[PDB]
Amino acid sequence: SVTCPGGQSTSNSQCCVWFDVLDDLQTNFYQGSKCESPVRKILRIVFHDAIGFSPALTAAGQFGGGGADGSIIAHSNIELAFPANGGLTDTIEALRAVGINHGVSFGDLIQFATAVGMSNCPGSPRLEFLTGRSNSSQPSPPSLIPGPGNTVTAILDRMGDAGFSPDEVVDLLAAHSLASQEGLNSAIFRSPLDSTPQVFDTQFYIETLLKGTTQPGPSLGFAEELSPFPGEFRMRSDALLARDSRTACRWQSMTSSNEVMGQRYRAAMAKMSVLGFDRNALTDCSDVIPSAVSNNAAPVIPGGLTVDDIEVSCPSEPFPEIATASGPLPSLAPAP
Numbered sequence: 001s002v003t004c005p006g007g008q009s010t011s012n013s014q015c016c017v018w019f020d021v022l023d024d025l026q027t028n029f030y031q032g033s034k035c036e037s038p039v040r041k042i043l044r045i046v047f048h049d050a051i052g053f054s055p056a057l058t059a060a061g062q063f064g065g066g067g068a069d070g071s072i073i074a075h076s077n078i079e080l081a082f083p084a085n086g087g088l089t090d091t092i093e094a095l096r097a098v099g100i101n102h103g104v105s106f107g108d109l110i111q112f113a114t115a116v117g118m119s120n121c122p123g124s125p126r127l128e129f130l131t132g133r134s135n136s137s138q139p140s141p142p143s144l145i146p147g148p149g150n151t152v153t154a155i156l157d158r159m160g161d162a163g164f165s166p167d168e169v170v171d172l173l174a175a176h177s178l179a180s181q182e183g184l185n186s187a188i189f190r191s192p193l194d195s196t197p198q199v200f201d202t203q204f205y206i207e208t209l210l211k212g213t214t215q216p217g218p219s220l221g222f223a224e225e226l227s228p229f230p231g232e233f234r235m236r237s238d239a240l241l242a243r244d245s246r247t248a249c250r251w252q253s254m255t256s257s258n259e260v261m262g263q264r265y266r267a268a269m270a271k272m273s274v275l276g277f278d279r280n281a282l283t284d285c286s287d288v289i290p291s292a293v294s295n296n297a298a299p300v301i302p303g304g305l306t307v308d309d310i311e312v313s314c315p316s317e318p319f320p321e322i323a324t325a326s327g328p329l330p331s332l333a334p335a336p
């Protein structure tokens with residue numbers, strides 16, 4: 001409909017400023033449209049920002065949090081002191097400056113930077129992007145972010161309160177396919193959670209189901225489990241969700257199709273992006289988001305492992321026929 005100053009066509013004039021913050025983020029924050037640590041950090045930030053939302057706290061007369069309101073930036077002084085929020089300061093400051101510089105709300109900017117960062121990573125779906133979230137927020141209540149040492153019941157209850165079913169919790173975890181850890185075991189900084197930390201694929205679901213065989217570092221860190229090969233980190237909550245009867249069959253269904261995984265993740269992320277808001281009050285600017293390059297590799301059980309090495313945990317459906325790789329056990333380099 002509209003033609004923005006830069007000659008791009010868009011659906012609504014409110015979308016035009018987003019082509020300028022697209023260019024700045026690609027050039028600066030993402031260092032030339034790369035899929036490296038800034039994208040992984042933004043993905044952890046969108047989750048920590050949107051999940052500070054609790055209907056139970058509201059019901060009990062308390063402030064339950066505003067959801068996807070950008071409070072992790074506006075109130076970074078209080079939220080970054082939460083233990084779930086370590087390692088985020090530098091990224092929050094960079095985002096703060098872009099927000100102030102372009103005059104966009106912090107809640108909208110975090111949703112936008114997530115859709116743009118994912119477009120830099122092969123295999124990613126185009127995420128929906130809505131604009132209009134109010135820039136005003138209150139600090140998130142503490143203790144609303146799931147931790148790696150929590151039990152599956154604990155995570156499902158917390159997530160359930162925020163609004164997600166057990167299935168959507170599994171769908172949301174596709175983001176650990178572009179992930180590493182830096183603070184659980186600092187001795188193996190940026191150790192990846194799957195073998196392709198730069199490709200949005202099914203490898204994370206396959207690899208967390210393999211038998212934990214290897215200790216990747218000198219000792220075990222906080223909530224660390226044995227992993228399937230050198231260089232890969234496995235955290236307890238992911239190991240447990242892959243195997244718990246409440247989530248095991250959805251986890252297994254996510255292993256053979258990058259197309260089904262991406263559709264499911266896109267839907268759960270659209271839901272998460274409007275926690276605390278009425279999406280009917282927001283303007284759709286999804287056409288601003290570029291396409292990612294496609295991932296053409298098929299799912300594989302890496303380095304010589306076979307089906308016999310995966311701990312099948314869904315009792316009702318057989319494990320999918322996934323390709324095996326004819327090689328020695330990989331050793332993963334740190335995520336870039």
Ligand code: HEM
Pocket residue numbers: 037039040041043044047087146147148155172173175176178179180181182183184235237335
């Ligand atoms: C079920 C709850 C979840 C738990 C308990 C959890 C926990 C963690 C932990 C402990 C780390 C390591 C951080 C570090 O030490 O550097 C991590 C990393 C990450 N998580 Fe999650 N996570 C969960 C859900 C999600 C969701 C829903 C998303 C986003 C949609 C997400 C995206 C990421 C990303 C991209 C990283 C990698 C960050 C980096 O490489 O620097 N996580 N997660």
Ligand SMILES: *[C@@H]1O[C@H](CO)[C@@H](O[C@@H]2O[C@H](CO)[C@@H](O)[C@H](O)[C@H]2NC(C)=O)[C@H](O)[C@H]1NC(C)=O
Pocket residue numbers: 073074075096099100103104105106135136
């Ligand atoms: C959104 O609200 C935040 C405050 O919560 C605004 O941030 C401040 O902006 C001024 C300049 O405009 C800076 O000098 C301050 O350092 C910022 N404070 C914080 C905590 O970031 C922000 O400008 C608001 N944005 C819009 C478009 O209204």
Ligand SMILES: *[C@@H]1O[C@H](CO)[C@@H](O)[C@H](O)[C@@H]1O
Pocket residue numbers: 216230231330331332333334
């Ligand atoms: C596998 O090899 C990588 C480097 O290729 C290491 O980072 C890892 O710890 C393991 O030795």
Ligand SMILES: O=C(NO)c1ccccc1O
Pocket residue numbers: 044083084085086145146147148183
């Ligand atoms: O990122 C987290 N949850 O998403 C997290 C939670 C508790 C402790 C450390 C962490 O990194």
Ligand SMILES: [Ca+2]
Pocket residue numbers: 048049050051052066067068069070071072140
């Ligand atoms: Ca928030």
Ligand SMILES: [Ca+2]
Pocket residue numbers: 176177178194195196197198199200201202203204
């Ligand atoms: Ca991956």
